Structure formats: C-alpha cells, structure tokens
Structure 1
C-alpha cells in the first residue's frame, strides 16, 4: 500500500509553487491529491518548500506532539504554508475550502529509516 512517508508527501508537499496564487488553491489541491475521495478532509496544510528542507525538520527542535507523543519536531525557520479548511458550503462530494497563505514554523512527527516526516502536527 502507500507508505506513511509517501502519504505525507501526497497530503502535504507542494514544492511546485511558492505560495497559493488564488482563493481556489485549496479546492483544486484537495481534489487532485485525492484528499476528498471518501469524505471531505476538514483541515489540511500544504508546505511550499523543497522536500529536503522539510525532511531536515526531523533533525531540528524536538517538541511534544499535540497528542503527547515525543517524536515531533519543530522547524527552526518559518516556511511558506497554505492552510485549507472546509467552509460552511462544503457538502460531500463537492468539498469546499477556504485558502489561507501564511509563513509559520511547522511541527511534524517523524518515524523510520531514513527518519522522515509522516504526520503534519501544527503550524505555529
């Protein structure tokens, strides 16, 4: 099946853009990444950084996860991120999102060999 590490890249990585360009960003990216296929995923963050800069977070500030796990890491640097959150007009299969572009530090959980991000925890 897809790896936890490949699922994080499909859900979270957008190295192909620097920032969301239009209020449509989340609607197009949630659908094309397959995030709306069984239900509307309600919150999802996109990171507009190279894959190497985000895998590097796994060697940065170790912090507790929101759930208490201690395999979380916070980026030293802020990153370009897009927060996509479902709107009150959102109704399955026509999921709809509000797009918010920001520069925030990211908190990811890491696992494995090589030790890479497998979960997006929070932007701060």
Structure 2
C-alpha cells in the first residue's frame, strides 16, 4: 500500500505527520493521489516527526493490531490529532473524494524499525513505520 519511491518511514510521515491542509478533503488528496485509491479513514497526528522518533525510544510493547509484534511504542502524552473519514467515494476521479474531519486529543502507539539503509537519512537510525493505534 506504499508507493515505491517511499521508505516505510517516509510513507508514515506522508500519511500521519505532514497534514498539508487543516481540511481533511485537501490533506487526503495527497495520500490518495499517491496510493491510487481513496483511503477510507486516516489519522494525522499534530506532532513532529522528531517527536515520534523519540517515542520510538519509549519501552517496547505489543502492537495492538498484531499480537505477534513487539516493535510498538506508546506516546508519553496525548496529542491533538485529526481523523479523516471518507464521506463521498470517487474511485474514477480521486480528486473528488470528500472527507469529514474529527479532532481529538489522544495517545498514540507507533511501530518503529531500523531505518532503510539505502534511502532513509542517517540522522534517524530508528524511525516510525506504522501508526498502530490511537487511544
């Protein structure tokens, strides 16, 4: 579900950090134009990539979405976030998909992995790769 020019960390940043508009309909155009389908729902955390990287330094826990993975990490604090929900599909014309937006303040659990050796910047050896749950 990730376009080939992205590492997992870059796709995480594109889907969950870089909300290019405060309006979900506009912000989701980026994700949808890249992945070639209107995503039914998506969460943008109102935080920085660096903050999430530091959450990767919190204790490892089981990933709620996968009882077999132990590469997840719970945020220390709640953050503001915007959850986008598709209201008007448009599979033949992705730019016309419309979304609702729901603001919330919640903790987050992210899966983190070692960076992509060839393509992720050496600045961050450990990077977030999935938004597993918001709580």
Per-residue deviation, 1:7: 1.1
> Which runs of at least 4 in structure 1 moved beyond 6 Å after TM superposition?
none
Are 2:112 and 2:129, in contact at CA under 8 Å, matched by a contact in 1? yes
- Distance in 1 between the 2:59 and 2:6 partners? 28
Q: CA deviation at 1:91?
A: 2.4
Answer yes or no: is the 8 Å Cα contact 1:13–1:46 preserved in 2.
yes
- The residue that corresponds to 2:81 in the other structure is 81
Per the TM alignment, residue 63 of structure 1 is displaced from its structure 2 partner at its CA by 2.2
Question: In 1, distance between residues paired with 2:60 and 2:19?
Answer: 24
Answer whether contact 1:62 1:73 (CA < 8 A) is retained: yes
1:40: which partner in 2? 38
Instruction: List gaps (5 residues or longer) in structure 2.
Output: 116-124
Cα-Cα RMSD: 1.9
What is the match of residue 58 of structure 1?
Answer: 56
Equivalent pairs, count: 115
Residue in structure 2 matched with residue 119 of structure 1 by the alignment: 130
Q: TM-score with structure 1 length normalisation?
A: 0.83
